[PDB]
Every structure is written in structure tokens, then in C-alpha cells.
PDB file of all heavy atoms in Angstrom:
ATOM      1  N   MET A   1     107.809  91.514  99.593  1.00 36.39           N
ATOM      2  CA  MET A   1     109.267  91.690  99.201  1.00 36.39           C
ATOM      3  C   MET A   1     109.349  92.591  98.014  1.00 36.39           C
ATOM      4  O   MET A   1     110.256  93.470  97.959  1.00 36.39           O
ATOM      5  CB  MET A   1     109.913  90.347  98.951  1.00 36.39           C
ATOM      6  CG  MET A   1     110.043  89.461 100.217  1.00 36.39           C
ATOM      7  SD  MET A   1     111.251  90.264 101.564  1.00 36.39           S
ATOM      8  CE  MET A   1     109.995  91.161 102.657  1.00 36.39           C
ATOM      9  N   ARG A   2     108.546  92.329  96.979  1.00 33.23           N
ATOM     10  CA  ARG A   2     108.557  93.190  95.782  1.00 33.23           C
ATOM     11  C   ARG A   2     108.370  94.657  96.177  1.00 33.23           C
ATOM     12  O   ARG A   2     109.117  95.525  95.687  1.00 33.23           O
ATOM     13  CB  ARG A   2     107.449  92.796  94.802  1.00 33.23           C
ATOM     14  CG  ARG A   2     107.524  91.360  94.196  1.00 33.23           C
ATOM     15  CD  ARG A   2     108.705  91.049  93.312  1.00 33.23           C
ATOM     16  NE  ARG A   2     109.878  90.779  94.153  1.00 33.23           N
ATOM     17  CZ  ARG A   2     110.096  89.754  94.922  1.00 33.23           C
ATOM     18  NH1 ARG A   2     109.328  88.709  94.918  1.00 33.23           N
ATOM     19  NH2 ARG A   2     111.197  89.731  95.667  1.00 33.23           N
ATOM     20  N   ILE A   3     107.430  94.970  97.036  1.00 33.06           N
ATOM     21  CA  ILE A   3     107.161  96.312  97.510  1.00 33.06           C
ATOM     22  C   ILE A   3     108.404  96.964  98.303  1.00 33.06           C
ATOM     23  O   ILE A   3     108.733  98.096  97.969  1.00 33.06           O
ATOM     24  CB  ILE A   3     105.888  96.396  98.340  1.00 33.06           C
ATOM     25  CG1 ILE A   3     104.714  95.990  97.481  1.00 33.06           C
ATOM     26  CG2 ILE A   3     105.727  97.783  98.971  1.00 33.06           C
ATOM     27  CD1 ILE A   3     103.404  95.604  98.234  1.00 33.06           C
ATOM     28  N   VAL A   4     108.919  96.147  99.156  1.00 30.83           N
ATOM     29  CA  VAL A   4     110.005  96.632 100.029  1.00 30.83           C
ATOM     30  C   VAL A   4     111.232  96.953  99.202  1.00 30.83           C
ATOM     31  O   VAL A   4     112.057  97.786  99.527  1.00 30.83           O
ATOM     32  CB  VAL A   4     110.389  95.620 101.124  1.00 30.83           C
ATOM     33  CG1 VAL A   4     111.718  95.921 101.730  1.00 30.83           C
ATOM     34  CG2 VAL A   4     109.340  95.585 102.188  1.00 30.83           C
ATOM     35  N   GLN A   5     111.415  96.206  98.073  1.00 29.14           N
ATOM     36  CA  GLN A   5     112.526  96.456  97.173  1.00 29.14           C
ATOM     37  C   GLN A   5     112.442  97.790  96.469  1.00 29.14           C
ATOM     38  O   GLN A   5     113.480  98.303  96.089  1.00 29.14           O
ATOM     39  CB  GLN A   5     112.589  95.300  96.212  1.00 29.14           C
ATOM     40  CG  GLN A   5     113.147  93.982  96.720  1.00 29.14           C
ATOM     41  CD  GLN A   5     113.271  92.975  95.613  1.00 29.14           C
ATOM     42  OE1 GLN A   5     112.248  92.421  95.185  1.00 29.14           O
ATOM     43  NE2 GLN A   5     114.513  92.725  95.131  1.00 29.14           N
ATOM     44  N   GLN A   6     111.251  98.335  96.304  1.00 26.80           N
ATOM     45  CA  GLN A   6     111.104  99.565  95.604  1.00 26.80           C
ATOM     46  C   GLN A   6     110.790 100.753  96.511  1.00 26.80           C
ATOM     47  O   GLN A   6     110.954 101.954  96.079  1.00 26.80           O
ATOM     48  CB  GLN A   6     109.964  99.476  94.602  1.00 26.80           C
ATOM     49  CG  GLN A   6     110.389  98.641  93.326  1.00 26.80           C
ATOM     50  CD  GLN A   6     109.173  98.610  92.352  1.00 26.80           C
ATOM     51  OE1 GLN A   6     108.709  97.492  91.903  1.00 26.80           O
ATOM     52  NE2 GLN A   6     108.757  99.761  92.019  1.00 26.80           N
ATOM     53  N   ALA A   7     110.247 100.563  97.692  1.00 28.25           N
ATOM     54  CA  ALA A   7     109.721 101.599  98.475  1.00 28.25           C
ATOM     55  C   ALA A   7     110.798 102.444  99.124  1.00 28.25           C
ATOM     56  O   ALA A   7     111.845 101.965  99.635  1.00 28.25           O
ATOM     57  CB  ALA A   7     108.765 101.046  99.602  1.00 28.25           C
ATOM     58  N   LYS A   8     110.644 103.797  99.102  1.00 29.06           N
ATOM     59  CA  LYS A   8     111.568 104.761  99.571  1.00 29.06           C
ATOM     60  C   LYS A   8     110.840 105.758 100.451  1.00 29.06           C
ATOM     61  O   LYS A   8     109.669 106.008 100.289  1.00 29.06           O
ATOM     62  CB  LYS A   8     112.207 105.515  98.399  1.00 29.06           C
ATOM     63  CG  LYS A   8     113.004 104.717  97.365  1.00 29.06           C
ATOM     64  CD  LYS A   8     113.440 105.531  96.160  1.00 29.06           C
ATOM     65  CE  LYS A   8     114.314 104.640  95.126  1.00 29.06           C
ATOM     66  NZ  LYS A   8     114.053 104.879  93.623  1.00 29.06           N
ATOM     67  N   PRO A   9     111.554 106.409 101.437  1.00 26.93           N
ATOM     68  CA  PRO A   9     111.006 107.448 102.266  1.00 26.93           C
ATOM     69  C   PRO A   9     110.224 108.431 101.406  1.00 26.93           C
ATOM     70  O   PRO A   9     110.675 108.826 100.284  1.00 26.93           O
ATOM     71  CB  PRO A   9     112.154 108.092 102.901  1.00 26.93           C
ATOM     72  CG  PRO A   9     113.136 106.961 103.052  1.00 26.93           C
ATOM     73  CD  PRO A   9     112.980 106.130 101.814  1.00 26.93           C
ATOM     74  N   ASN A  10     109.062 108.798 101.951  1.00 29.86           N
ATOM     75  CA  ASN A  10     108.124 109.788 101.294  1.00 29.86           C
ATOM     76  C   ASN A  10     107.115 109.077 100.343  1.00 29.86           C
ATOM     77  O   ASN A  10     106.239 109.700  99.826  1.00 29.86           O
ATOM     78  CB  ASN A  10     108.813 110.960 100.631  1.00 29.86           C
ATOM     79  CG  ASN A  10     109.798 111.694 101.501  1.00 29.86           C
ATOM     80  OD1 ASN A  10     109.725 111.673 102.725  1.00 29.86           O
ATOM     81  ND2 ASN A  10     110.736 112.363 100.874  1.00 29.86           N
ATOM     82  N   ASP A  11     107.228 107.774 100.104  1.00 28.51           N
ATOM     83  CA  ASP A  11     106.272 107.029  99.315  1.00 28.51           C
ATOM     84  C   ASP A  11     104.971 106.832 100.077  1.00 28.51           C
ATOM     85  O   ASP A  11     104.937 106.854 101.306  1.00 28.51           O
ATOM     86  CB  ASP A  11     106.816 105.687  98.953  1.00 28.51           C
ATOM     87  CG  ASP A  11     107.895 105.666  97.828  1.00 28.51           C
ATOM     88  OD1 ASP A  11     108.152 106.718  97.258  1.00 28.51           O
ATOM     89  OD2 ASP A  11     108.447 104.556  97.613  1.00 28.51           O
ATOM     90  N   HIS A  12     103.934 106.490  99.316  1.00 27.68           N
ATOM     91  CA  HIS A  12     102.604 106.259  99.754  1.00 27.68           C
ATOM     92  C   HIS A  12     102.162 104.894  99.191  1.00 27.68           C
ATOM     93  O   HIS A  12     101.937 104.798  97.971  1.00 27.68           O
ATOM     94  CB  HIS A  12     101.719 107.366  99.327  1.00 27.68           C
ATOM     95  CG  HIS A  12     102.142 108.703  99.781  1.00 27.68           C
ATOM     96  ND1 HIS A  12     101.719 109.219 101.003  1.00 27.68           N
ATOM     97  CD2 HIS A  12     103.091 109.572  99.321  1.00 27.68           C
ATOM     98  CE1 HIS A  12     102.373 110.365 101.207  1.00 27.68           C
ATOM     99  NE2 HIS A  12     103.190 110.601 100.190  1.00 27.68           N
ATOM    100  N   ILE A  13     102.077 103.897 100.092  1.00 28.78           N
ATOM    101  CA  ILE A  13     101.705 102.582  99.712  1.00 28.78           C
ATOM    102  C   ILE A  13     100.202 102.410  99.893  1.00 28.78           C
ATOM    103  O   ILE A  13      99.693 102.343 100.990  1.00 28.78           O
ATOM    104  CB  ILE A  13     102.421 101.485 100.473  1.00 28.78           C
ATOM    105  CG1 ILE A  13     103.971 101.637 100.338  1.00 28.78           C
ATOM    106  CG2 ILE A  13     102.038 100.097  99.949  1.00 28.78           C
ATOM    107  CD1 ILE A  13     104.740 100.670 101.207  1.00 28.78           C
ATOM    108  N   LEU A  14      99.489 102.278  98.735  1.00 27.22           N
ATOM    109  CA  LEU A  14      98.047 102.282  98.774  1.00 27.22           C
ATOM    110  C   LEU A  14      97.535 100.817  98.526  1.00 27.22           C
ATOM    111  O   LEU A  14      97.691 100.258  97.432  1.00 27.22           O
ATOM    112  CB  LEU A  14      97.500 103.202  97.665  1.00 27.22           C
ATOM    113  CG  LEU A  14      96.009 103.171  97.362  1.00 27.22           C
ATOM    114  CD1 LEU A  14      95.117 103.572  98.491  1.00 27.22           C
ATOM    115  CD2 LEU A  14      95.705 103.990  96.086  1.00 27.22           C
ATOM    116  N   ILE A  15      96.968 100.228  99.577  1.00 24.38           N
ATOM    117  CA  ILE A  15      96.548  98.858  99.560  1.00 24.38           C
ATOM    118  C   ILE A  15      95.037  98.821  99.233  1.00 24.38           C
ATOM    119  O   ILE A  15      94.242  99.262 100.044  1.00 24.38           O
ATOM    120  CB  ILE A  15      96.832  98.124 100.846  1.00 24.38           C
ATOM    121  CG1 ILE A  15      98.327  98.169 101.181  1.00 24.38           C
ATOM    122  CG2 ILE A  15      96.280  96.727 100.768  1.00 24.38           C
ATOM    123  CD1 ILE A  15      98.625  97.827 102.561  1.00 24.38           C
ATOM    124  N   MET A  16      94.710  98.270  98.141  1.00 25.10           N
ATOM    125  CA  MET A  16      93.301  98.251  97.653  1.00 25.10           C
ATOM    126  C   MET A  16      92.812  96.835  97.630  1.00 25.10           C
ATOM    127  O   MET A  16      93.297  95.948  96.803  1.00 25.10           O
ATOM    128  CB  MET A  16      93.298  98.940  96.269  1.00 25.10           C
ATOM    129  CG  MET A  16      93.307 100.483  96.363  1.00 25.10           C
ATOM    130  SD  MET A  16      93.280 101.419  94.662  1.00 25.10           S
ATOM    131  CE  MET A  16      94.924 100.712  94.034  1.00 25.10           C
ATOM    132  N   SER A  17      91.820  96.519  98.452  1.00 24.60           N
ATOM    133  CA  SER A  17      91.185  95.196  98.591  1.00 24.60           C
ATOM    134  C   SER A  17      90.013  95.318  99.512  1.00 24.60           C
ATOM    135  O   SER A  17      90.125  96.110 100.447  1.00 24.60           O
ATOM    136  CB  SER A  17      92.161  94.216  99.302  1.00 24.60           C
ATOM    137  OG  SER A  17      91.543  92.948  99.554  1.00 24.60           O
ATOM    138  N   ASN A  18      88.942  94.572  99.262  1.00 28.79           N
ATOM    139  CA  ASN A  18      87.858  94.515 100.311  1.00 28.79           C
ATOM    140  C   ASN A  18      88.037  93.343 101.280  1.00 28.79           C
ATOM    141  O   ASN A  18      87.175  93.130 102.077  1.00 28.79           O
ATOM    142  CB  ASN A  18      86.472  94.505  99.650  1.00 28.79           C
ATOM    143  CG  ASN A  18      86.270  93.300  98.805  1.00 28.79           C
ATOM    144  OD1 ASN A  18      87.246  92.536  98.643  1.00 28.79           O
ATOM    145  ND2 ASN A  18      85.031  93.082  98.347  1.00 28.79           N
ATOM    146  N   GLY A  19      89.156  92.712 101.223  1.00 29.94           N
ATOM    147  CA  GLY A  19      89.522  91.611 102.203  1.00 29.94           C
ATOM    148  C   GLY A  19      90.758  91.853 103.000  1.00 29.94           C
ATOM    149  O   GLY A  19      91.368  92.945 102.883  1.00 29.94           O
ATOM    150  N   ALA A  20      91.168  90.851 103.732  1.00 28.50           N
ATOM    151  CA  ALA A  20      92.329  91.049 104.637  1.00 28.50           C
ATOM    152  C   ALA A  20      93.695  91.082 103.938  1.00 28.50           C
ATOM    153  O   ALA A  20      94.656  91.543 104.532  1.00 28.50           O
ATOM    154  CB  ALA A  20      92.279  89.946 105.736  1.00 28.50           C
ATOM    155  N   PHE A  21      93.752  90.495 102.734  1.00 31.88           N
ATOM    156  CA  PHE A  21      94.961  90.545 101.885  1.00 31.88           C
ATOM    157  C   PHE A  21      96.123  89.933 102.725  1.00 31.88           C
ATOM    158  O   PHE A  21      97.209  90.577 102.678  1.00 31.88           O
ATOM    159  CB  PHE A  21      95.178  91.944 101.458  1.00 31.88           C
ATOM    160  CG  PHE A  21      96.041  92.112 100.153  1.00 31.88           C
ATOM    161  CD1 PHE A  21      95.914  93.362  99.465  1.00 31.88           C
ATOM    162  CD2 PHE A  21      96.801  91.111  99.622  1.00 31.88           C
ATOM    163  CE1 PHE A  21      96.584  93.592  98.297  1.00 31.88           C
ATOM    164  CE2 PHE A  21      97.480  91.340  98.402  1.00 31.88           C
ATOM    165  CZ  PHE A  21      97.383  92.582  97.777  1.00 31.88           C
ATOM    166  N   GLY A  22      95.886  88.908 103.450  1.00 33.89           N
ATOM    167  CA  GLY A  22      96.863  88.208 104.270  1.00 33.89           C
ATOM    168  C   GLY A  22      97.494  89.074 105.415  1.00 33.89           C
ATOM    169  O   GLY A  22      98.512  88.771 105.922  1.00 33.89           O
ATOM    170  N   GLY A  23      96.831  90.164 105.769  1.00 37.99           N
ATOM    171  CA  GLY A  23      97.414  91.117 106.665  1.00 37.99           C
ATOM    172  C   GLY A  23      98.535  91.881 106.098  1.00 37.99           C
ATOM    173  O   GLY A  23      99.502  92.212 106.776  1.00 37.99           O
ATOM    174  N   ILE A  24      98.465  92.221 104.790  1.00 39.70           N
ATOM    175  CA  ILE A  24      99.649  92.802 104.160  1.00 39.70           C
ATOM    176  C   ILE A  24     100.055  94.145 104.698  1.00 39.70           C
ATOM    177  O   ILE A  24     101.239  94.508 104.781  1.00 39.70           O
ATOM    178  CB  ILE A  24      99.447  92.877 102.632  1.00 39.70           C
ATOM    179  CG1 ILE A  24     100.738  93.156 101.858  1.00 39.70           C
ATOM    180  CG2 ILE A  24      98.346  93.913 102.301  1.00 39.70           C
ATOM    181  CD1 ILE A  24     100.627  92.977 100.313  1.00 39.70           C
ATOM    182  N   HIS A  25      99.066  94.938 105.183  1.00 36.76           N
ATOM    183  CA  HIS A  25      99.455  96.218 105.771  1.00 36.76           C
ATOM    184  C   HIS A  25     100.317  96.077 107.000  1.00 36.76           C
ATOM    185  O   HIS A  25     101.297  96.792 107.167  1.00 36.76           O
ATOM    186  CB  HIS A  25      98.250  97.130 106.116  1.00 36.76           C
ATOM    187  CG  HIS A  25      97.428  96.700 107.232  1.00 36.76           C
ATOM    188  ND1 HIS A  25      96.292  95.899 107.105  1.00 36.76           N
ATOM    189  CD2 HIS A  25      97.427  97.047 108.558  1.00 36.76           C
ATOM    190  CE1 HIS A  25      95.697  95.717 108.235  1.00 36.76           C
ATOM    191  NE2 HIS A  25      96.365  96.396 109.199  1.00 36.76           N
ATOM    192  N   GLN A  26     100.050  95.036 107.852  1.00 36.27           N
ATOM    193  CA  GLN A  26     100.897  94.738 109.029  1.00 36.27           C
ATOM    194  C   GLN A  26     102.249  94.204 108.547  1.00 36.27           C
ATOM    195  O   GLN A  26     103.276  94.468 109.191  1.00 36.27           O
ATOM    196  CB  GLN A  26     100.243  93.784 109.999  1.00 36.27           C
ATOM    197  CG  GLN A  26     101.252  93.350 111.073  1.00 36.27           C
ATOM    198  CD  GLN A  26     101.662  94.475 111.916  1.00 36.27           C
ATOM    199  OE1 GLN A  26     100.853  95.282 112.484  1.00 36.27           O
ATOM    200  NE2 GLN A  26     103.025  94.655 112.017  1.00 36.27           N
ATOM    201  N   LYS A  27     102.187  93.289 107.566  1.00 37.18           N
ATOM    202  CA  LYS A  27     103.439  92.768 107.012  1.00 37.18           C
ATOM    203  C   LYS A  27     104.408  93.815 106.542  1.00 37.18           C
ATOM    204  O   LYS A  27     105.559  93.761 106.786  1.00 37.18           O
ATOM    205  CB  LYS A  27     103.117  91.771 105.824  1.00 37.18           C
ATOM    206  CG  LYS A  27     102.608  90.430 106.266  1.00 37.18           C
ATOM    207  CD  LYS A  27     102.433  89.472 105.071  1.00 37.18           C
ATOM    208  CE  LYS A  27     101.790  88.118 105.454  1.00 37.18           C
ATOM    209  NZ  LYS A  27     102.771  87.220 106.239  1.00 37.18           N
ATOM    210  N   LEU A  28     103.880  94.829 105.851  1.00 39.18           N
ATOM    211  CA  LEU A  28     104.637  96.029 105.354  1.00 39.18           C
ATOM    212  C   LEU A  28     105.171  96.772 106.522  1.00 39.18           C
ATOM    213  O   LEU A  28     106.382  97.143 106.499  1.00 39.18           O
ATOM    214  CB  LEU A  28     103.815  96.808 104.399  1.00 39.18           C
ATOM    215  CG  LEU A  28     103.637  96.317 102.981  1.00 39.18           C
ATOM    216  CD1 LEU A  28     102.469  96.973 102.285  1.00 39.18           C
ATOM    217  CD2 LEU A  28     104.977  96.351 102.240  1.00 39.18           C
ATOM    218  N   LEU A  29     104.367  97.146 107.481  1.00 41.11           N
ATOM    219  CA  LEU A  29     104.801  97.989 108.631  1.00 41.11           C
ATOM    220  C   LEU A  29     106.000  97.284 109.334  1.00 41.11           C
ATOM    221  O   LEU A  29     106.968  97.939 109.709  1.00 41.11           O
ATOM    222  CB  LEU A  29     103.710  98.367 109.570  1.00 41.11           C
ATOM    223  CG  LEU A  29     102.645  99.320 109.020  1.00 41.11           C
ATOM    224  CD1 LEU A  29     101.443  99.404 109.900  1.00 41.11           C
ATOM    225  CD2 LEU A  29     103.210 100.684 108.687  1.00 41.11           C
ATOM    226  N   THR A  30     105.903  95.961 109.471  1.00 43.56           N
ATOM    227  CA  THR A  30     107.024  95.177 110.016  1.00 43.56           C
ATOM    228  C   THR A  30     108.207  95.165 109.053  1.00 43.56           C
ATOM    229  O   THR A  30     109.295  95.517 109.473  1.00 43.56           O
ATOM    230  CB  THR A  30     106.551  93.746 110.379  1.00 43.56           C
ATOM    231  OG1 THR A  30     105.653  93.813 111.494  1.00 43.56           O
ATOM    232  CG2 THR A  30     107.787  92.923 110.758  1.00 43.56           C
TER     233      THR A  30
END
């Protein structure tokens, strides 16, 4: 939610973790 509140077209969301991070990349795409 924090991310979605700030993210705008043309942004680059860089997810840095050596684990699954709760599937946050899929959560964001949704």
C-alpha cells in the first residue's frame, strides 16, 4: 500500500531481497 500510494507511470520499483518477500512483486503487479 505504501508503494502504490507513491508509484506513478514511468517509475522503476526495485525489489531487493534474497527471499520471497511474501510474493511482493506479484502483489504489486496486481
